[PDB]
Design an enzyme around this catalytic site. Structure first.
Site, PDB file in Angstrom:
ATOM      1  N   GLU A  46       3.485  16.946  28.557  1.00 41.97           N
ATOM      2  CA  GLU A  46       3.585  15.574  28.055  1.00 41.97           C
ATOM      3  C   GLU A  46       3.060  14.587  29.095  1.00 41.97           C
ATOM      4  O   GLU A  46       3.836  13.797  29.651  1.00 41.97           O
ATOM      5  CB  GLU A  46       5.032  15.236  27.720  1.00 41.97           C
ATOM      6  N   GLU A  85      13.137  21.237  28.229  1.00 41.45           N
ATOM      7  CA  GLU A  85      12.211  20.219  28.721  1.00 41.45           C
ATOM      8  C   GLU A  85      12.584  19.921  30.167  1.00 41.45           C
ATOM      9  O   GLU A  85      13.684  19.424  30.434  1.00 41.45           O
ATOM     10  CB  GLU A  85      12.268  18.953  27.862  1.00 41.45           C
ATOM     11  N   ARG A 141      12.168  17.599  32.866  1.00 38.20           N
ATOM     12  CA  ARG A 141      11.634  16.241  32.869  1.00 38.20           C
ATOM     13  C   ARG A 141      11.140  15.769  34.236  1.00 38.20           C
ATOM     14  O   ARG A 141      10.434  14.759  34.306  1.00 38.20           O
ATOM     15  CB  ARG A 141      12.670  15.269  32.322  1.00 38.20           C
ATOM     16  N   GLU A 178       1.893  11.382  30.531  1.00 38.41           N
ATOM     17  CA  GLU A 178       1.843   9.959  30.217  1.00 38.41           C
ATOM     18  C   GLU A 178       1.008   9.226  31.261  1.00 38.41           C
ATOM     19  O   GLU A 178       0.966   9.623  32.425  1.00 38.41           O
ATOM     20  CB  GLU A 178       3.248   9.358  30.180  1.00 38.41           C
ATOM     21  N   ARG A 186      18.303  12.138  27.503  1.00 36.79           N
ATOM     22  CA  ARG A 186      17.115  11.912  28.315  1.00 36.79           C
ATOM     23  C   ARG A 186      17.415  11.449  29.741  1.00 36.79           C
ATOM     24  O   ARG A 186      16.472  11.182  30.498  1.00 36.79           O
ATOM     25  CB  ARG A 186      16.219  10.874  27.641  1.00 36.79           C
ATOM     26  N   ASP A 207     -19.056  25.596  49.206  1.00 38.21           N
ATOM     27  CA  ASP A 207     -18.428  25.423  50.512  1.00 38.21           C
ATOM     28  C   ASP A 207     -16.913  25.338  50.324  1.00 38.21           C
ATOM     29  O   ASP A 207     -16.391  24.305  49.892  1.00 38.21           O
ATOM     30  CB  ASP A 207     -18.981  24.168  51.175  1.00 38.21           C
ATOM     31  N   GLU A 255       3.722   3.778  25.198  1.00 36.48           N
ATOM     32  CA  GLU A 255       4.957   4.213  25.823  1.00 36.48           C
ATOM     33  C   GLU A 255       5.845   3.022  26.209  1.00 36.48           C
ATOM     34  O   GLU A 255       5.547   1.869  25.911  1.00 36.48           O
ATOM     35  CB  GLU A 255       4.627   5.120  27.008  1.00 36.48           C
ATOM     36  N   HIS A 308       6.431  15.710  31.343  1.00 42.41           N
ATOM     37  CA  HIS A 308       7.478  16.626  30.931  1.00 42.41           C
ATOM     38  C   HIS A 308       6.858  17.979  30.632  1.00 42.41           C
ATOM     39  O   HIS A 308       5.792  18.074  30.018  1.00 42.41           O
ATOM     40  CB  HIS A 308       8.243  16.126  29.699  1.00 42.41           C
ATOM     41  N   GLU A 330       0.872   7.616  25.773  1.00 43.03           N
ATOM     42  CA  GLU A 330       1.198   9.026  25.629  1.00 43.03           C
ATOM     43  C   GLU A 330       0.325   9.612  24.536  1.00 43.03           C
ATOM     44  O   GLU A 330       0.100   8.979  23.500  1.00 43.03           O
ATOM     45  CB  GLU A 330       2.685   9.242  25.287  1.00 43.03           C
TER      46      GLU A 330
HETATM   47  N1  LIG Z   1       8.492  26.778  21.940  1.00 40.85           N
HETATM   48  C1  LIG Z   1       7.944  25.848  22.729  1.00 40.85           C
HETATM   49  N2  LIG Z   1       7.733  26.033  24.050  1.00 40.85           N
HETATM   50  C2  LIG Z   1       7.184  25.078  24.835  1.00 40.85           C
HETATM   51  N3  LIG Z   1       6.800  23.883  24.368  1.00 40.85           N
HETATM   52  C3  LIG Z   1       6.966  23.602  23.062  1.00 40.85           C
HETATM   53  C4  LIG Z   1       7.557  24.566  22.135  1.00 40.85           C
HETATM   54  N4  LIG Z   1       7.597  24.003  20.908  1.00 40.85           N
HETATM   55  C5  LIG Z   1       7.083  22.766  21.051  1.00 40.85           C
HETATM   56  N5  LIG Z   1       6.728  22.547  22.338  1.00 40.85           N
HETATM   57  C6  LIG Z   1       6.076  21.402  22.969  1.00 40.85           C
HETATM   58  O1  LIG Z   1       6.885  20.300  23.321  1.00 40.85           O
HETATM   59  C7  LIG Z   1       6.055  19.136  23.226  1.00 40.85           C
HETATM   60  C8  LIG Z   1       7.010  17.955  23.137  1.00 40.85           C
HETATM   61  O2  LIG Z   1       6.444  17.032  22.265  1.00 40.85           O
HETATM   62  P1  LIG Z   1       6.958  15.566  22.288  1.00 40.85           P
HETATM   63  O3  LIG Z   1       6.771  15.146  20.869  1.00 40.85           O
HETATM   64  O4  LIG Z   1       6.198  14.871  23.383  1.00 40.85           O
HETATM   65  O5  LIG Z   1       8.567  15.664  22.555  1.00 40.85           O
HETATM   66  P2  LIG Z   1       9.457  14.524  23.320  1.00 40.85           P
HETATM   67  O6  LIG Z   1       8.397  13.456  23.569  1.00 40.85           O
HETATM   68  O7  LIG Z   1      10.526  14.092  22.337  1.00 40.85           O
HETATM   69  O8  LIG Z   1       9.980  15.296  24.526  1.00 40.85           O
HETATM   70  C9  LIG Z   1       4.986  19.502  22.195  1.00 40.85           C
HETATM   71  O9  LIG Z   1       3.847  19.142  22.979  1.00 40.85           O
HETATM   72  C10 LIG Z   1       5.014  20.980  21.951  1.00 40.85           C
HETATM   73  O10 LIG Z   1       3.720  21.554  22.096  1.00 40.85           O
HETATM   74  C1  LIG Z   2      10.956   7.620  26.707  1.00 40.09           C
HETATM   75  S1  LIG Z   2      10.216   9.002  27.646  1.00 40.09           S
HETATM   76  O1  LIG Z   2      11.478   9.661  27.286  1.00 40.09           O
HETATM   77  C2  LIG Z   2       9.415   8.367  29.179  1.00 40.09           C
HETATM   78  C3  LIG Z   2      10.111   9.044  30.397  1.00 40.09           C
HETATM   79  C4  LIG Z   2       9.642   8.489  31.755  1.00 40.09           C
HETATM   80  N1  LIG Z   2       8.383   7.765  31.636  1.00 40.09           N
HETATM   81  C5  LIG Z   2       9.425   9.619  32.756  1.00 40.09           C
HETATM   82  O2  LIG Z   2       9.231  10.803  32.337  1.00 40.09           O
HETATM   83  O3  LIG Z   2       9.407   9.384  34.004  1.00 40.09           O
HETATM   84  N2  LIG Z   2       9.642  10.447  27.401  1.00 40.09           N
HETATM   85  P1  LIG Z   2       9.433  11.287  25.905  1.00 40.09           P
HETATM   86  O4  LIG Z   2       7.959  11.503  25.646  1.00 40.09           O
HETATM   87  O5  LIG Z   2       9.990  12.685  26.076  1.00 40.09           O
HETATM   88  O6  LIG Z   2      10.091  10.573  24.728  1.00 40.09           O
HETATM   89 MG   LIG Z   3       9.260  14.653  26.542  1.00 41.61          MG
HETATM   90 MG   LIG Z   4       7.028   9.951  26.924  1.00 40.61          MG
HETATM   91 MG   LIG Z   5       6.798  12.529  23.814  1.00 40.94          MG
END
Ligand SMILES: Nc1ncnc2c1ncn2[C@@H]1O[C@H](COP(=O)(O)OP(=O)(O)O)[C@@H](O)[C@H]1O
Ligand SMILES: C[S@](=O)(CC[C@H](N)C(=O)O)=NP(=O)(O)O
Ligand SMILES: [Mg+2]
Ligand SMILES: [Mg+2]
Ligand SMILES: [Mg+2]
Ligand SMILES: Nc1ncnc2c1ncn2[C@@H]1O[C@H](COP(=O)(O)OP(=O)(O)O)[C@@H](O)[C@H]1O
Ligand SMILES: C[S@](=O)(CC[C@H](N)C(=O)O)=NP(=O)(O)O
Ligand SMILES: [Mg+2]
Ligand SMILES: [Mg+2]
Ligand SMILES: [Mg+2]
Ligand SMILES: [Mg+2]
Ligand SMILES: [Mg+2]
Ligand SMILES: [Mg+2]
Ligand SMILES: [Mg+2]
Lengths: 443, 443
Positions: A131, A332, A334, A133, A315, A52, A188, A244, A195
């Site tokens: 990412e 990234e 965010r 969380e 960040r 449906d 986190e 993210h 996370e």
């Molecule tokens: N070339 C890429 N394109 C898109 N995402 C990527 C690439 N290389 C790595 N990543 C992703 O980015 C993510 C960020 O990981 P993370 O350790 O959570 O970084 P942070 O938390 O510092 O932002 C990983 O999940 C990875 O799969």
């Molecule tokens: C320290 S945090 O930077 C958490 C960010 C926040 N909770 C938000 O994205 O809204 N993120 P990361 O996984 O990228 O280190």
């Molecule tokens: Mg991140």
């Molecule tokens: Mg985080």
């Molecule tokens: Mg992270």
């Protein structure tokens, strides 16, 4: 590299699978599914499974209810927590109309549509590493959630300050058995927040991952007497949760964003791409932050963006450029939060990014600085615009952007706007406990 | 011996550990870690992997917030309470910047920096045997700690006066199966107080030994329905917990503090070192006693120091030289409490001592009496200074000392002063229930 109807037919007999879950995703990002006994496999593979459509949020009306499911065979996976007589497997599906027209309202298919546009522009894959969380709340007497977080821990804490240690281990275990390439697991910033990261994938796969991820996070949590939630800002004055969206374009096995020549290793494809996201960020935040509660997290001081800018290793801004280079070169985004419909949010970001490439825009100046400690006219100096403050201001930003309308197509676009406007107006007439505590005695 | 990557690889395979736990310590001494699956082993060993430094206290700002981890491979250890398929190894890490530099803010890096200046002056190893006393409180039903203590037992008491035998035996057991050389366990003076001692080791692994020890006690205490607290003075009227720092210098497997020929049995190197410890005590007390609460331990009558002085066999002064000689020959700095950051505190006492060797200082003569029963005027006579009484005066003593600014380097010095000054200016504003009990009816 894709699976055939007989591929799937063999898996069902090899592992002695007993039931199938056909899963798909509505306009809210909410996964839906029916379970059929594997005796119905041939009906499933000949695309004759009906449901449906009127009973799904952003779909069809009651007078045209009938709709079909079409399984994407590559999405096959078996649930590693199921028995032998109860082994359940999954196929993720695209939605079709009775006439065999794919549904203009399917979120997954709409992303498949926007990815053909990036291909005609010479890119082989659009990779997303999400990412998501989440917070973990404790359950009560009768199984329903409470407002008591599962710990008072913080960033990178360990046990017993971090009490979701075992629960996160159980989520990595089942996830790894489902073919997830897990990368890290940790407590986190905010009390009760967690996370778990996993390797990026191509656009369609990555979104399928998010949906699976949520799915496993929530049920395993329940088995640990916890309630998981991906709400943006469950609580005032602590970090919110953000999904993210790490993204990058590949011209095939090679990361079009990475430059082995320059000191900052970014190509001008990447600069142009970041240009488009920044230009169109106002138009697409209603979609990356689609709850009222999404804007209670877009407040300064919690590592969530409030201001449209980009920077590296930083960040505070809307776009962080992480330090990694090489095949890990990425932007990234965010602002995305885990309530977003992934398929739609990635469609948004992609077509904004492809807007910068097709129009060869030059990116603004990196804001290499703590954008929170900047004041309204100190940022008005360098030309830094705000993201929408409320969900209502976000939709208006949407009605006046031209790119989000292309990224979504007319159906999703209208159904999304129509729903969220009703959503705002229920909220807008609520009277908070805040208003009563501040105004009932004082006035 | 010193482990190398392929040594690491082989242990991972030969034992099927499935999870790495990478740990480092923040400025407040608190352990920090992320779990990553063994998938990522090679990303670990190529120091390729990152975290968010702005969410670590005493580290970087959000604009410059990307940092990396370099694992000290010699710290390999498998948790003996993790079975297969959920089996976790750990690696302590050093912290590096995006430019590949060690982080000036890493407390552990810093201990290593100072130990290098000790090799300059011709010592091979700086051994420390710590004595981290603790309290055990009873948990309530919903899991949170209460103020009821686990027994009412005393120094060296047995069961059933001592109701911690069984919690301690489990702690001792896990610790030996992590490689610790345990030396004793017993009930300590205050009701609910407990001690577990272990052999000394070189400065770095000993501080690592303290962090592991702390984490293993709090874990096991929960298993037994208890809350372990390393708070210095959780309760008025009964002893606090100290972390006695037993230290000495080695010229290569020779106890450089031992003189076999003289009656007292101390070398002039040990004397110089005490001179430096005794001269700089006020300057390093904030770092050894970083809590407001640290200073309710440092009050006469409790086997804990409050006057700067040294004596053998004597448990009232800041420094005690225990009777044992030979390789057991050590000085015991009794000011240290278990809230102290081990790496920082050791760095602080190491340089104070080095200050005395390099400048060939001469020791105050010992105070061979119960220095709690000496009047302020009686103590001024022999020229005996007081330890700082508040965290604020301790901070004042710290801002005015030059040996400690070089033990920490500017980043840790500045970060700690800043953070702790603020921690004080909240405390100084809160109204104690002591105040409302004595004053609120009388006035
Ligand atoms: N070339 C890429 N394109 C898109 N995402 C990527 C690439 N290389 C790595 N990543 C992703 O980015 C993510 C960020 O990981 P993370 O350790 O959570 O970084 P942070 O938390 O510092 O932002 C990983 O999940 C990875 O799969
Ligand atoms: C320290 S945090 O930077 C958490 C960010 C926040 N909770 C938000 O994205 O809204 N993120 P990361 O996984 O990228 O280190
Ligand atoms: Mg991140
Ligand atoms: Mg985080
Ligand atoms: Mg992270
Ligand atoms: N040469 C040394 N340098 C540093 N510590 C030492 C040395 N010899 C013994 N120790 C340590 O002193 C500690 C003794 O603690 P403990 O027996 O509780 O002494 P106390 O009598 O002060 O309670 C042990 O940690 C042991 O390893
Ligand atoms: C008997 S006690 O001397 C107790 C000291 C007290 N807990 C404190 O240092 O605050 N310490 P030790 O274990 O060195 O004998
Ligand atoms: Mg048919
Ligand atoms: Mg299983
Ligand atoms: Mg690499
Ligand atoms: Mg002792
Ligand atoms: Mg003791
Ligand atoms: Mg002692
Ligand atoms: Mg001599």
């Amino acid at each position: 590299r894709t699976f055939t109807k007989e591929d799937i037919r063999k898996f069902v007999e090899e592992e002695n699978v007993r039931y199938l879950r056909l899963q798909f995703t509505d306009i809210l990002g909410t996964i839906k599914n029916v379970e059929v006994p594997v005796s119905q496999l041939e009906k499933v593979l000949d695309n004759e499974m009906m449901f449906d459509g009127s009973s799904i949020e952003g779909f069809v009306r009651i007078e045209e209810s009938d709709m079909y499911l079409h399984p994407d065979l590559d999405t096959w996976v078996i649930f590693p927590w199921t028995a032998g007589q109860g082994k359940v497997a999954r196929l993720i599906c695209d939605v079709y109309k009775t006439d065999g027209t794919p549904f203009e309202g399917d979120p997954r298919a709409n992303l498949k549509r926007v990815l053909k546009e990036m291909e005609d522009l010479g890119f082989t894959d659009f990779n997303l590493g999400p990412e998501p969380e989440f917070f973990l709340f404790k359950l009560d007497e009768k199984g329903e959630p409470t407002l008591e977080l599962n710990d008072d821990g913080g960033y990178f804490d360990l046990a017993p300050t971090d009490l979701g240690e075992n629960c996160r281990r159980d989520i990595v275990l089942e996830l790894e058995d489902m073919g997830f390439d897990i990368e890290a697991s940790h407590h986190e910033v905010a009390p009760g927040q967690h996370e778990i990261d996993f390797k990026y994938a191509d656009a369609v796969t990555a979104c399928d991952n998010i949906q699976t991820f949520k799915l496993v996070v929530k049920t395993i949590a329940r088995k640990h007497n916890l309630h998981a939630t991906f709400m943006p800002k469950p609580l005032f004055g602590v970090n919110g949760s953000g999904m993210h969206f790490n993204v990058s374009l590949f011209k095939g096995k090679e990361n079009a964003f990475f430059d082995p020549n320059t000191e900052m290793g970014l190509t001008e494809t990447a600069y142009q791409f970041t240009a488009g996201v920044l230009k169109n960020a106002r138009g697409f935040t209603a979609v990356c932050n689609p709850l009222v509660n999404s804007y209670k997290r877009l407040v300064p001081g919690y590592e969530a963006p409030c201001y449209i800018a980009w920077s590296g290793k930083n960040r505070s801004p809307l776009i962080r450029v992480p330090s990694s280079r090489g095949l890990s070169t990425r932007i990234e985004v965010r602002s995305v939060d885990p309530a977003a419909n992934p398929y739609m949010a990635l469609a948004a970001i992609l077509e904004a990014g492809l807007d910068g490439i097709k129009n060869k825009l030059k990116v603004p100046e990196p804001v290499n600085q703590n954008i929170y400690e900047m004041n309204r006219e100190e940022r008005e100096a360098v030309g830094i615009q705000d993201l929408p403050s409320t969900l209502y201001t976000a939709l208006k930003a949407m009605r006046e952007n031209e790119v989000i309308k292309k990224a979504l197509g007319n159906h999703i676009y209208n159904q999304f706007i129509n729903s969220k406007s009703i959503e705002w107006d229920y909220y807008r007439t609520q009277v908070s406990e805040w208003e009563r505590d501040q105004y009932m005695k004082q006035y």
